[PDB]
Amino acid sequence: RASKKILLPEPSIRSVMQKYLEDRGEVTFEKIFSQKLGYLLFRDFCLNHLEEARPLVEFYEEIKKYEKLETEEERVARSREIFDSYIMKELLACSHPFSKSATEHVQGHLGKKQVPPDLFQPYIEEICQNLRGDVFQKFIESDKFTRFCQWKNVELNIHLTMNDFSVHRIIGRGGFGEVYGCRKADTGKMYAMKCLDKKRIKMKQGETLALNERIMLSLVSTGDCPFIVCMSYAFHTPDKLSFILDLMNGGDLHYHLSQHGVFSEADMRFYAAEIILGLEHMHNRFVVYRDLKPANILLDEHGHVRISDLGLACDFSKKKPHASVGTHGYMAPEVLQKGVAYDSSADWFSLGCMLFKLLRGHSPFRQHKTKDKHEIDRMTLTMAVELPDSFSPELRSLLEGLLQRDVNRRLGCLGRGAQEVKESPFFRSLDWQMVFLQKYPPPLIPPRGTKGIKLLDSDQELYRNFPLTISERWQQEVAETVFDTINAETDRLEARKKAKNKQLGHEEDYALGKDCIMHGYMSKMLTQWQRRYFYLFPNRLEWRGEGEAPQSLLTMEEIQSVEETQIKERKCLLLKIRGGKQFILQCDSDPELVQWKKELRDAYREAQQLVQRVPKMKNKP
């Protein structure tokens, strides 16, 4: 359920948005087809409004169902099923036969009963070839691309505040603030909101930690990892910073270890497997976690787990870190040693230390429940790990591997990363795709039932580039909640306006048959704002009210400059006019502002360049 409603802009937003996207090279088959909302609008167009592309998209979606099948027995069944039925239409289509090369490849695998998930990948490549030419061009001309622009404009104008969320009870507490459960009002999706108080951050000097987490969440939150607490939005108010994160109600694994007591090998195996896939995700994006420990593992309501706090994590792609970071008892030798640079190697040692603690109740380099940090660090560098007789040989193999002091000897550091750990004898029983799909049963289901001051310009500028929205997260949220209903409602609204404009007789477009560059709504201004519809031509900017032709304008000659400016909170365009006059314009979105700023500057500079070499038109001394 969504309390608030998203309102799409009118189809006329296309004029601006198409150009915005075109200047960024974003109007391409690859760019749009790979976006969730782009795909859905493209398939709608092909399945319902273009008969020649219909069977191509139908067959594409059939292959995608085949890709997701878990067992080979199923893939034997489908691969037959697919090849027997409705391939016959494709072979009989004169415009679209699949290649000899492609069919010879597919029939070769199939003829030997070889049925991998990517069996039909050649047919995907030729479907995309046939979809990205004329079909794509016709899609771009259609109202489904207009509708894409309408959605895209919403995406590029997100400005979140606390009023955009329905905040609920506190479900977690930290030094610089607290975590709340919340529902997003637009869509109704449940989320975690991590609120960090700025007055606290400045007091305890934790600016870098807060900013780093923000950066690290950006790198990690793409690709939909089921095993990391990912971000969808970052935003901030005058007093608070806010991360919108995956909601994890089940408490952390340190708390559960403290309630449950130690785990068996079989229960630890479950947690280890899911955690490994999380680290793999980070390491492929060149992030070293550095603080892997039970308290940084969270449980969801079903008992599945994710890795949590990224504030101590580090991007090692360009420069490898060397500072001693993490928690004592879990830090690697190469980390503890000042001056020695380390990569992802640190996390595999940490893993070994954590997995040991899940089985025994303490870090292997924490002897006799001691609190001496100098001792713990020292045992790590020199003490050989006395593994109990209780442990299986497969476990013993794995922990010997992970806790090698030398990186060149250590498991997950010999060349291939997480794959080396995955194929360790301890995990022999596991299908790793099933781990990824969260199909193995969790061993533990959680039960259902001081003083700060002075925030200045100096401090607020630290969080200038804090706000962010991750495109695929937003689109996925929209797609699975309100996309269907809001598309149907907007179709109704547009049809009503179309049919009403037929009744009124105002059914002619002023932008057509001339040399109009671009057009759309803007707001002009002594006190109140006058919203009007603007048409930009190469020598002038005109505007109209509703139900009339334009009756006022500015010429490109008059415009001396185009600059941005803040009136109150919102940004505006400032046109400086010939003879010390001014014209202020307010746009309805950020893309619109960017485009109008650009196109106006281009239009005035080019016009004044033309005029100067025409004697009849130019100003004479």
Binding site: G513, K514, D515, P538, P550, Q551, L553, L610, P615, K616
Partner: protein, 339 residues
């Protein structure tokens, strides 16, 4: 070599032409007209103010009925007006914003216009179907269209910033005749009443007389110190007036092959944009960059009066065929009808 010898023959001929002209200069028009009475204070008043253009007016042209006129504007439209009522007959949104000139066919069936599109576009007014639409786009010029005038429904003369003028056959859309000769941009042109001849004015500071039938420059007239922005035939075809950036107008006789008079004032320093004679030829009316139109006694060179109604450059003007009214168009976006 060959070039040095031809440079020396060019001055020999130029000097022969100077001296031939000097041999004809036996008296001045001023001297000949000393006996005739002044015209007195001409006090014309604004009888209509035509509102509709949203930006600068660049050109206008009266229809032969002395009632309808076309105007062309920076707003990217032609408007055809009924001057007697102020009603608009047609508003024509153009394909190109950059229009500079316009024209009205003698028949009243067609109008033409163009500018930085480099195209003279012909519009059919009373179509067989109903609406106003483009009948022809005349492409050929290498530069902007500066002026154009119909001879008949199938023939139109054009001038261009490419330095040429041209005669078109509108059916074929081809240049029947090209008129090369000018050194710089061509700004204005004017047809002779009989239509066998026409004159052009240009940024080379010269006016040329052309033979329409044959396609040749017969005579060239110098004297102006700067660009010639406008040109107009005297009613009988034997003379024409020019308007220039040098702040003077000038009268030229074809048969005497020289300047007769200069129309100037020490206080007037701005450029002349447009010129036209009254029906009898006695008054020469010129529009200026100082927002005024001045009325000159063409025979005596006295300023007879002023049309002072616009708030920016008077960019164009025209006198009706019946002689009843003067129209001025301005950068302030209005046209005024005066008498």
């Amino acid at each position: 070599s060959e070039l040095d010898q031809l440079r020396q023959e060019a001055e020999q001929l130029k000097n022969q032409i100077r001296d031939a002209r000097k041999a004809c200069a036996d008296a001045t028009l001023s001297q000949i007209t000393n006996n005739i009475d002044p015209v007195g204070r001409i006090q014309m008043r604004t009888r209509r103010t035509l509102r509709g253009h949203l930006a600068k007016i660049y050109a206008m042209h009266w229809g032969t009925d002395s009632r309808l006129l076309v105007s062309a504007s920076q707003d990217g439209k032609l408007i055809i007006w009924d001057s007697y009522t102020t009603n608009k007959v047609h508003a024509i949104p153009l394909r190109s914003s950059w229009v500079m000139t316009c024209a009205y066919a003698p028949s009243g069936n067609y109008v033409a216009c163009g500018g930085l599109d480099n195209i003279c576009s012909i519009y059919n007014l009373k179509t067989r179907e109903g609406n106003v639409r483009v009948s022809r786009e005349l492409a050929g010029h290498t530069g902007y269209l500066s002026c154009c005038r119909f001879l008949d429904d199938n023939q139109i003369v054009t001038s261009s910033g490419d330095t040429t003028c041209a005669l078109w056959d509108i059916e074929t859309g081809q240049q029947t005749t090209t008129f090369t000769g000018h050194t710089g941009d061509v700004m204005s042109l004017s047809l002779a009443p009989d239509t066998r001849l026409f004159v052009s004015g240009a940024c080379d500071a010269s006016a040329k007389l052309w033979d329409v039938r044959e396609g040749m420059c017969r005579q060239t007239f110098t004297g102006h110190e700067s660009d010639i922005n406008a040109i107009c035939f005297f009613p009988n075809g034997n003379a024409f007036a020019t308007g220039s950036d040098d702040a003077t107008c000038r009268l030229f006789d074809l048969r005497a092959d020289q300047e007769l008079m200069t129309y100037s004032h020490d206080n007037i320093i701005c450029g002349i944009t447009s010129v036209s004679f009254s029906k009898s030829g006695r008054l020469l009316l010129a529009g200026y960059d100082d927002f005024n139109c001045n009325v000159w006694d063409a025979l005596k060179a006295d300023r007879a009066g002023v049309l002072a109604g616009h708030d920016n450059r008077v960019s164009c003007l025209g006198v009706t065929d019946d002689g009843m009214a003067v129209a001025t168009g301005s950068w302030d976006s209005f046209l005024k009808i005066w008498n």
